[PDB]
From Swiss-Prot, chain B:
Quaternary structure annotation from Swiss-Prot or TrEMBL: Interacts with the decoration protein; each hexon binds a single copy of the decoration protein. Interacts with the portal protein.
Mutation effect (residue 42 to V): Confers resistance to Pycsar-mediated defense
Protein's recorded name: Major capsid protein
Source organism of this protein record: Escherichia phage T5 (Enterobacteria phage T5)
Part of the intact protein present: 160 to 209 of 458
Cysteine disulfide partners in this protein: none
Function text: Major capsid protein that self-associates to form 120 hexamers and 11 pentamers, building the T=13 icosahedral capsid which about 860 Angstroms in diameter. Responsible for its self-assembly into a procapsid. The phage does not need to encode a separate scaffolfing protein because its capsid protein contains the delta domain that carries that function. The capsid gains its final stability through the reorganization of the subunits that takes place upon expansion. DNA encapsidation through the portal triggers capsid expansion and the binding of the decoration protein to the capsid exterior.
Location(s) in or outside the cell: Virion
Tree of life domain: Viruses
Length: 50, 50
């Protein structure tokens, strides 16, 4: 599962040259979410007399 | 008792069992004084003879 924002830092416009800041954001970070399974079980019996 | 098992299967109390419609009887004493002597027919109330 992905993450969102993502904050781009505005630049006052004194300079030219590129000369571009970018808020130093992680290019590819993701989150694993993992699932697990439980088991319900029962037993019954029948005696050889009833 | 009748209510068996009780861990764990479904078992009832009484009135599960099959009933029978035949009637039995013990060997009664033989009938002999009521079926030995001779009958005399009559037609009134008292009979007289000489």
């Amino acid at each position: 599962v992905e993450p969102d924002a993502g904050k781009a830092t505005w630049v006052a416009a004194s300079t030219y040259g590129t000369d571009t800041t970018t808020g130093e954001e992680v290019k590819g970070a993701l989150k694993e979410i993992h699932f697990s399974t439980y088991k319900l079980a029962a037993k019954s019996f029948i005696t050889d007399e009833t | 008792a009748v209510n068996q098992s009780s861990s764990v299967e479904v078992s009832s109390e009484s009135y599960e069992t099959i009933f029978s419609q035949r009637i039995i009887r013990d060997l009664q004493k033989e009938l002999v004084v009521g079926a030995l002597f001779e009958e005399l027919p009559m037609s009134s109330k008292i009979l007289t003879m000489l």
